[PDB]
Amino acid sequence: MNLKDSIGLRIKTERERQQMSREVLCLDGAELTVRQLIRIEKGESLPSLDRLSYIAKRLGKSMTELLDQDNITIPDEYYEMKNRLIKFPTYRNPDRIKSKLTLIEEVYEKFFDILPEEELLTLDILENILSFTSWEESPKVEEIYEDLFEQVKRKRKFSTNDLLVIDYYFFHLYGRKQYDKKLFERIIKRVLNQEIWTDDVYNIVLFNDLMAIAALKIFHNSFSDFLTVVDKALAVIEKSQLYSYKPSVFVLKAKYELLHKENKKEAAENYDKAIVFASVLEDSVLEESIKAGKLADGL
């Protein structure tokens, strides 16, 4: 018996004492789904502060009562390590990808017993995306993702964790000819409406979501709001000083000019801005990769 078992049993015992069904407790599932509540009551998942507060309100209990002497405090070292690994750029370098995956597993194992389901899923998302693991081969992660995405897709203000769930949604769309276009537009619009503050962790995750959006729009040949995506990516770069990512945004503007405007001159000029920027950064690997892209696009 661990922390998850003790809290889950307490919640289940009180829910059953009140003769309350899971469906009644969870209402429309916006804050807690039935499967999420089942996993909590079985001791498979720990409730986050937010889920625990919701459950206590529905049961007419205080969080203190539901906790008794149990302590769900997440050590600050967890967030320190999670933030460090989100700010750890791979640059598509396989050695750095492997190091980042090692960091993810380190934090996952060290804090497993004290993390709520949402945090563990966040780590599983990063591992699967970075290792290019098919979501179809990860069925337990997928079941948990499904309900978190049903909750995120109803929101208009996204936390860092929400943006990572959204990143895993974009991962489902990679290379997929068939997709729900109305859902994608809805998600796109809300991501573009997030405010950019001084949270570098948030901004990096937001930036990567914008790049995923841009890449899917090119793939689907759907360029509505594409310049909005470009402008928001540039604003994130400025707020968090993410200058090594700026050439990739100039390359996005080139694709827009080349594929949507069919303006080869302005596409070439945007490629040249990316190349000069990479060169001034003295990032030769990036510079040559962009020069190859310019030539491969016939410019």
Author numbering: 1 to 299
Give the published text:
Here, we elucidate the structure-function relationship of the transcription factor ComR, a new member of the RNPP family, which positively controls competence for natural DNA transformation in streptococci. ComR is directly activated by the binding of its associated pheromone XIP, the mature form of the comX/sigX-inducing-peptide ComS. XIP-binding induces release of the sequestered HTH domain and ComR dimerization to allow DNA binding. Each TPR domain is composed of 11 α-helices forming 5 TPR motifs followed by an additional C-terminal α-helix α16 called CAP.
The crystal structure of the apo form of ComR from S. thermophilus has been determined at a resolution of 1.95 Å in the space group C 2 2 2 with 1 molecule per asymmetric unit. Assembly analysis of the crystal contacts using PDBePISA suggested that apo ComR is a monomer. Size Exclusion Chromatography combined to Multi Angle Laser Light Scattering (SEC-MALLS) analysis clearly established that apo ComR is a monomer in solution, with a measured molecular weight of 41 kDa for a calculated value of 36.5 kDa. In the absence of peptide, the HTH domain is sequestered by the TPR domain of the ComR monomer, generating a new interface of 874.9 Å2. Interestingly, this interface involves the HTH residues R35, R39 and R51, which have been shown to be directly implicated in DNA-binding. In the apo form of the protein, they form salt bridges with TPR-2 residues: R35 with E146 and D147, R39 with E117, and R51 with E118. The residue pair E117-E118, which belongs to the strongly conserved L115PEEE119 motif located in loop α7-α8 between TPR-1 and TPR-2, thus plays an important role in stabilizing the inactive apo form of the protein. Superimposition of the apo and bound forms of the ComR TPR domain (rmsd of 2.4 Å over 212 aligned Cα atoms) showed that the main difference concerns helix α9, which was broken in the dimeric complex and forms a more canonical TPR-2 motif in the apo structure. Interestingly, crystal contacts generate a dimerization interface similar to the dimeric bound form of the protein, with a conserved K246-E282 salt bridge. However, the small overall interface (537.9 Å2) and the poor calculated solvation free energy gain (ΔiG of -1.9 kcal.mol-1) characterizing this contact in the apo structure suggest that the monomer-dimer equilibrium is shifted toward the monomeric form in the absence of peptide and that the dimer would not be stable in the absence of crystal packing forces.
